[PDB]
Design a protein around this ligand. Structure first.
Ligand SMILES: Nc1ncnc2c1ncn2[C@@H]1O[C@H](COP(=O)(O)O)[C@@H](O)[C@H]1O
Length: 168
């Protein structure tokens, strides 16, 4: 039903909230939740682990079936699969892992995938275990995404830093 509440409006199409993306998905029942995926859709840690656990591993079983027949994604690419109990659809998006030396320039390609969907619940791509600067990821989101994006950031200190930096 896409009933988003409690978000700051950063721009005409980008919103942010200090919240667990899993709890937001259960409250909002969005058309699309974004997963911060890797190319073989191994949902072990960070956002991907939280989402998969909240589906009681249904996301991992579906992802394994997709990989078996289609092979891995490319960095910057995406894949629509079922959203299980969290959303109608899950958009699995692969941002660059800069900790593994992947090219940060592909973060724009990663966010471009959002433009195929009118409204998304999403995390900050490539932040967290992927090692990108969270402020940079928010700027690439704001500069690249034209559709309505509701960002959920769990950590209060990171959220307050992001909002402070954006509002300079
Ligand atoms: N459950 C969660 N809900 C919301 N944001 C999260 C959650 N877990 C991690 N994050 C943030 O989401 C972004 C992507 O994290 P990661 O999945 O580690 O690449 C980073 O800004 C993390 O701080």
């Amino acid at each position: 039903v896409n009933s988003f509440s409690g978000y700051l409006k950063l721009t005409d199409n980008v919103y942010i909230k200090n919240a667990d993306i899993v709890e937001e998905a259960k409250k909002v029942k969005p058309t699309v939740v974004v997963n911060a995926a890797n190319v073989y859709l191994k949902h072990g840690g960070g956002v991907a682990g939280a989402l998969n656990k909240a589906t009681n591993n249904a996301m991992q079983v579906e992802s394994d079936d997709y990989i078996a027949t289609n092979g891995p994604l490319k960095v910057g690419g995406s894949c629509v699969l079922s959203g299980h109990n969290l959303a109608k659809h899950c958009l699995h998006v692969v941002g660059p892992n800069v900790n593994k030396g992947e090219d940060i320039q592909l973060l724009k390609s990663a966010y471009e995938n959002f433009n195929q969907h009118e409204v998304l619940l999403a995390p900050l791509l490539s932040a967290g275990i992927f090692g990108a600067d969270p402020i940079h990821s928010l700027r690439v989101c704001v500069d690249t995404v034209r559709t309505n994006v509701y960002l959920a950031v769990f950590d209060k200190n990171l959220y307050d830093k992001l909002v402070s930096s954006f509002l300079e």
